[PDB]
Amino acid sequence: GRDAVILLTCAIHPELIFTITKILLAILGPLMVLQAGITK
């Protein structure tokens, strides 16, 4: 749940989880959404 994971996120491999959050926002792909099953 909460009130524990946030503490473990900054205490256990914080330099790696932050990088995942940055890629998490880039995993959507606003341009890719306009190319799903296109040009057929």
Curated annotation (Swiss-Prot):
The compartments listed are:
Host endoplasmic reticulum membrane; Host lipid droplet
> What's the domain of life for this entry?
Viruses
Required co-factor(s) are: Zn(2+)
Q: Where are the transmembrane segments?
A: 14-34
Entry membrane topology? Multi-pass membrane protein
* Cofactor binding description: Activity of protease NS2 is dependent on zinc ions and completely inhibited by EDTA. This is probably due to the fact that NS2 protease activity needs NS3 N-terminus that binds a zinc atom (active region NS2-3).
Modification note: Palmitoylation is required for NS2/3 autoprocessing and E2 recruitment to membranes.
How it assembles, according to the record, is: Homodimer. Interacts with host SPCS1; this interaction is essential for viral particle assembly. Interacts with envelope glycoprotein E1. Interacts with envelope glycoprotein E2. Interacts with viroporin p7. Interacts with serine protease/helicase NS3. Part of the replication complex composed of NS2, NS3, NS4A, NS4B, NS5A and the RNA-directed RNA polymerase embedded in an ER-derived membranous web. Part of the viral assembly initiation complex composed of NS2, E1, E2, NS3, NS4A, NS5A and the mature core protein.
Role according to the record: Cysteine protease required for the proteolytic auto-cleavage between the non-structural proteins NS2 and NS3. The N-terminus of NS3 is required for the function of NS2 protease (active region NS2-3). Promotes the initiation of viral particle assembly by mediating the interaction between structural and non-structural proteins.
Q: Domain comment? A: The N-terminus of NS3 is required for the catalytic activity of protease NS2. The minimal catalytic region includes the C-terminus of NS2 and the N-terminus NS3 protease domain (active region NS2-3).
Name used for this protein in its record: Protease NS2
